[PDB]
Design a protein around this motif. Structure first.
Motif, PDB file in Angstrom:
ATOM      1  N   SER A  89       0.865  -1.200   0.000  1.00  0.00           N
ATOM      2  CA  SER A  89       0.000   0.000   0.000  1.00  0.00           C
ATOM      3  C   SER A  89       0.893   1.238   0.000  1.00  0.00           C
ATOM      4  CB  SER A  89      -0.950   0.003   1.172  1.00  0.00           C
ATOM      5  OG  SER A  89      -0.255   0.176   2.398  1.00  0.00           O
ATOM      6  N   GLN A  90       0.350   2.387  -0.406  1.00  0.00           N
ATOM      7  CA  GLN A  90       1.190   3.591  -0.585  1.00  0.00           C
ATOM      8  C   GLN A  90       1.661   4.133   0.765  1.00  0.00           C
ATOM      9  OE1 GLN A  90       3.153   4.442  -2.673  1.00  0.00           O
ATOM     10  NE2 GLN A  90       3.464   6.643  -2.818  1.00  0.00           N
ATOM     11  N   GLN A  91       0.929   3.931   1.860  1.00  0.00           N
ATOM     12  CA  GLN A  91       1.283   4.604   3.135  1.00  0.00           C
ATOM     13  C   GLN A  91       2.553   3.971   3.717  1.00  0.00           C
ATOM     14  OE1 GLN A  91      -1.674   3.168   2.246  1.00  0.00           O
ATOM     15  NE2 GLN A  91      -3.344   3.996   3.483  1.00  0.00           N
ATOM     16  N   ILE A  92       2.588   2.643   3.825  1.00  0.00           N
ATOM     17  CA  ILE A  92       3.791   1.933   4.338  1.00  0.00           C
ATOM     18  C   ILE A  92       4.932   2.169   3.348  1.00  0.00           C
ATOM     19  CG2 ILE A  92       2.422   0.303   5.677  1.00  0.00           C
ATOM     20  CD1 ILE A  92       3.424  -1.879   3.572  1.00  0.00           C
TER      21      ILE A  92
ATOM     22  N   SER B  53       7.720  -0.069  -6.711  1.00  0.00           N
ATOM     23  CA  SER B  53       6.704   1.011  -6.781  1.00  0.00           C
ATOM     24  C   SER B  53       7.067   1.935  -7.940  1.00  0.00           C
ATOM     25  CB  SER B  53       6.586   1.741  -5.492  1.00  0.00           C
ATOM     26  OG  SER B  53       6.033   0.897  -4.495  1.00  0.00           O
ATOM     27  N   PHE B  54       6.760   1.462  -9.145  1.00  0.00           N
ATOM     28  CA  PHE B  54       7.049   2.120 -10.438  1.00  0.00           C
ATOM     29  C   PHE B  54       5.749   2.483 -11.159  1.00  0.00           C
ATOM     30  CE2 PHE B  54       8.031   1.430 -15.048  1.00  0.00           C
ATOM     31  CZ  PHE B  54       8.833   2.535 -15.229  1.00  0.00           C
ATOM     32  N   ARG B  55       4.809   1.535 -11.245  1.00  0.00           N
ATOM     33  CA  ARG B  55       3.578   1.666 -12.064  1.00  0.00           C
ATOM     34  C   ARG B  55       2.651   2.757 -11.508  1.00  0.00           C
ATOM     35  NH1 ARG B  55      -1.444   0.392  -9.006  1.00  0.00           N
ATOM     36  NH2 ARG B  55      -0.836  -1.299  -7.590  1.00  0.00           N
ATOM     37  N   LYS B  56       2.579   2.920 -10.182  1.00  0.00           N
ATOM     38  CA  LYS B  56       1.541   3.763  -9.526  1.00  0.00           C
ATOM     39  C   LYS B  56       2.118   5.137  -9.164  1.00  0.00           C
ATOM     40  CE  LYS B  56       0.482   2.271  -5.190  1.00  0.00           C
ATOM     41  NZ  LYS B  56      -0.094   1.361  -4.172  1.00  0.00           N
ATOM     42  N   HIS B  57       3.208   5.157  -8.394  1.00  0.00           N
ATOM     43  CA  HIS B  57       3.893   6.381  -7.911  1.00  0.00           C
ATOM     44  C   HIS B  57       5.189   6.553  -8.703  1.00  0.00           C
ATOM     45  CE1 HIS B  57       0.767   5.582  -4.993  1.00  0.00           C
ATOM     46  NE2 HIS B  57       0.724   6.907  -4.885  1.00  0.00           N
ATOM     47  N   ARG B  58       5.029   7.018  -9.942  1.00  0.00           N
ATOM     48  CA  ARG B  58       6.126   7.248 -10.909  1.00  0.00           C
ATOM     49  C   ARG B  58       6.770   8.624 -10.679  1.00  0.00           C
ATOM     50  NH1 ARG B  58      10.741   6.195 -13.613  1.00  0.00           N
ATOM     51  NH2 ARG B  58      10.563   6.567 -15.862  1.00  0.00           N
TER      52      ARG B  58
ATOM     53  N   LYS C  56       8.543   4.284   4.401  1.00  0.00           N
ATOM     54  CA  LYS C  56       9.903   3.711   4.263  1.00  0.00           C
ATOM     55  C   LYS C  56      10.602   4.344   3.058  1.00  0.00           C
ATOM     56  CE  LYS C  56       8.287  -0.251   1.597  1.00  0.00           C
ATOM     57  NZ  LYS C  56       7.182  -1.226   1.751  1.00  0.00           N
ATOM     58  N   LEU C  57       9.845   4.682   2.013  1.00  0.00           N
ATOM     59  CA  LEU C  57      10.396   5.324   0.799  1.00  0.00           C
ATOM     60  C   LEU C  57      10.757   6.772   1.096  1.00  0.00           C
ATOM     61  CD1 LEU C  57      10.543   4.677  -2.510  1.00  0.00           C
ATOM     62  CD2 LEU C  57       8.800   6.500  -2.487  1.00  0.00           C
ATOM     63  N   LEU C  58       9.979   7.473   1.913  1.00  0.00           N
ATOM     64  CA  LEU C  58      10.328   8.856   2.289  1.00  0.00           C
ATOM     65  C   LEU C  58      11.525   8.818   3.228  1.00  0.00           C
ATOM     66  CD1 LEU C  58       9.886  11.888   2.261  1.00  0.00           C
ATOM     67  CD2 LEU C  58       8.058  11.574   3.920  1.00  0.00           C
ATOM     68  N   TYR C  59      11.695   7.733   3.982  1.00  0.00           N
ATOM     69  CA  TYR C  59      12.951   7.528   4.727  1.00  0.00           C
ATOM     70  C   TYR C  59      14.098   7.402   3.722  1.00  0.00           C
ATOM     71  CZ  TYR C  59      15.974   6.460   8.631  1.00  0.00           C
ATOM     72  OH  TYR C  59      16.940   6.527   9.595  1.00  0.00           O
ATOM     73  N   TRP C  60      13.898   6.622   2.661  1.00  0.00           N
ATOM     74  CA  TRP C  60      14.889   6.528   1.560  1.00  0.00           C
ATOM     75  C   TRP C  60      15.067   7.877   0.856  1.00  0.00           C
ATOM     76  CZ3 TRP C  60      18.683   3.453   1.211  1.00  0.00           C
ATOM     77  CH2 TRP C  60      18.583   2.124   1.634  1.00  0.00           C
ATOM     78  N   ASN C  61      13.991   8.638   0.696  1.00  0.00           N
ATOM     79  CA  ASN C  61      14.046   9.940  -0.004  1.00  0.00           C
ATOM     80  C   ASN C  61      14.884  10.911   0.812  1.00  0.00           C
ATOM     81  OD1 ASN C  61      12.265   8.687  -1.738  1.00  0.00           O
ATOM     82  ND2 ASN C  61      10.517   9.994  -1.248  1.00  0.00           N
ATOM     83  N   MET C  62      14.577  11.008   2.099  1.00  0.00           N
ATOM     84  CA  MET C  62      15.370  11.867   2.995  1.00  0.00           C
ATOM     85  C   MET C  62      16.785  11.294   3.073  1.00  0.00           C
ATOM     86  SD  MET C  62      15.972  10.230   6.100  1.00  0.00           S
ATOM     87  CE  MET C  62      15.647  11.017   7.672  1.00  0.00           C
TER      88      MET C  62
END
Length: 132
Positions: A13-16, A72-77, A20-26
């Motif tokens: 799901s996008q929230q989890i 997470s490529f197809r949805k949140h590009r 973790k991805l915004l942890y990767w982003n930061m």
């Protein structure tokens, strides 16, 4: 800490995903400014630990982060494309830093220089591979 963060699935799901991805982003934006902070600091111990530990940081980026780019490529590009454009500028900056590492000619740094260089080739080819 960067070894610990695992890539989930594409069906997550996008929230989890986002936490973790915004942890990767930061993380990668922290990496970019961590590269940007080196141009002001000196005392070869600083550049020595940079050449030690930044290597294993980007290895974590290979094994852990870019699988999320695949998953997470197809949805949140748009978010991941913004993140990769964030990373390409620090990639060119890392080219400048590797040039700075070669030009000083230090015997202590040069054991782990060519190993870091082969890891540089590894990380850039992994970036090209997981962009596909």
């Amino acid at each position: 800490t960067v070894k610990k963060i695992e890539p989930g699935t594409a069906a997550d799901s996008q929230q989890i995903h986002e936490e973790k991805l915004l942890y990767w982003n930061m993380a990668v934006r922290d990496f970019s400014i961590l590269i940007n902070l080196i141009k002001v600091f000196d005392s070869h111990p600083v550049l020595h630990v940079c050449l030690k530990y930044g290597r294993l940081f980007v290895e974590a980026f290979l094994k852990q982060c870019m699988p999320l780019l695949d998953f997470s490529f197809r949805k949140h590009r748009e978010d991941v494309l913004s993140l990769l454009e964030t990373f390409q500028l620090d990639t060119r900056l890392l080219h400048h830093l590797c040039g700075h590492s070669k030009i000083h000619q230090d015997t202590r740094l040069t054991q782990h220089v060519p190993l870091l260089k082969k890891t540089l080739e590894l990380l850039v080819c992994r970036v090209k591979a997981m962009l596909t």
